[PDB]
């Protein structure tokens, strides 16, 4: 009845090894306060966004759409250079996708009202790649793992672009170590301001 991830803690309730990627890792007991269905929806959503984002950073470094507005190797510069109209078009399209794909059940109070609704399962299988039920368990597992890995990787890429103003693989190929004089962490109250 101990956790498998954290052997010295007890196994958290609402974690029973049914879900893919369920290794018993819930030390702060978020699952005891927040329903595990909402948490798995949020984990799958974050992970999918990050999977695309990590691939976005790498591909944006290599391949570009034509034009000077899309010639930003460093991804943090692409945010500012890419046309505002089209970026807000992306944002509005995301909002329409969120309301329709969730079928107007978006709030914490109303989502999962239908007992048929499954965490992360929006009905998205355009090419019916999940039609085979033999592959279902390992697909669910590898989707969860790809999402977790990509959350960590995109977090690293964004803050390494902040520290080193270089695109990620160009940072790997033209590497420069931290001086430590720059990018001081904290310090707003030690010097009493300014």
């Amino acid at each position: 009845a101990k956790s498998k991830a954290v052997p010295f803690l007890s196994q958290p309730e609402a974690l029973d090894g049914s879900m893919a990627g369920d290794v018993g890792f819930d030390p702060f007991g978020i699952s005891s306060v927040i329903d595990i269905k909402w948490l798995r929806e949020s984990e799958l959503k974050h992970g999918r966004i990050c999977m695309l984002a990590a691939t976005g950073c790498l591909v944006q470094e290599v391949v570009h759409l034509p034009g000077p507005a899309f010639s930003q190797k460093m991804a943090l510069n692409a945010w500012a250079a890419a046309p505002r109209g089209g970026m807000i078009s992306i944002l509005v399209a995301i909002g329409l996708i969120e309301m329709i794909s969730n079928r107007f059940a978006l709030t914490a109070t109303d989502m999962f009202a239908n007992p048929n609704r499954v965490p992360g399962d929006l009905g998205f299988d355009p090419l019916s790649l999940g039609a085979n039920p033999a592959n279902r368990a390992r697909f669910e597992l590898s989707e969860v793992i790809h999402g977790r890995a990509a959350m960590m990787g995109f977090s690293g890429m964004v803050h390494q672009m902040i520290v080193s103003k270089q695109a990620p693989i160009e940072q790997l190929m033209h590497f420069k170590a931290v001086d430590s004089s720059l990018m001081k962490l904290g310090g707003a109250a030690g010097n009493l301001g300014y």
């Binding site: 306060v33 927040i34 978006l106 709030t107 914490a108 109070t109 109303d110 009493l192 301001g193 300014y194």
Partner: protein, 161 residues
């Protein structure tokens, strides 16, 4: 420009406001040596003052005879960032707070002791409600038309007259 006002970037009194504000700081800086903490602090203030005046000059604000920026709130779109757009942001947040608090009060009515839920708040349920407020205009209007926002006049206690 509008109402006989002058854009702050070319009003000379805005320029005198900036110059007097910087001389006031520089005469305080004249009593300190270069690398000291009071000298560094006052130089940071001088840079902040100059930045604020420069930004206001290029923002489309309209200074008066006094040289202080004035706000136009009659509804014209060239000045919507001074009242109409901050107002839209406010009404979204205020309606969020109202919708979320109303949802918790209706949940707390269906509790074992309804008055214990309001001095000892159910924090997971209340956080569930605080997250729902992002689509309050649609949720509240659908609540209205479904006859669940407004209660009829004969379920409301009134005074004898």
């Amino acid at each position: 420009d509008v109402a006989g006002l002058t854009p702050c970037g070319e009003s000379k009194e805005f320029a005198r406001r900036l110059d007097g504000s910087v001389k006031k700081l520089q005469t305080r800086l004249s009593k300190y040596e270069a690398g000291t903490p009071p000298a560094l602090a006052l130089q940071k203030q001088i840079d902040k003052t100059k930045n604020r005046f420069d930004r206001y000059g290029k923002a489309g604000l309209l200074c008066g005879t006094d040289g202080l920026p004035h706000l136009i709130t009659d509804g014209r779109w060239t000045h919507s960032g001074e009242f109409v757009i901050p107002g839209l942001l406010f009404l979204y947040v205020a309606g969020w707070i109202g919708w979320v608090g109303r949802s918790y009060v209706l949940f707390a009515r269906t509790a074992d002791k309804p008055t214990e839920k309001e001095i000892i708040i159910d924090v997971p349920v209340a956080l569930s409600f605080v997250s729902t407020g992002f689509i309050w205009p649609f949720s509240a209007f659908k609540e209205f038309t479904s006859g669940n926002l407004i209660v009829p006049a004969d379920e409301i206690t009134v005074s004898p007259r």
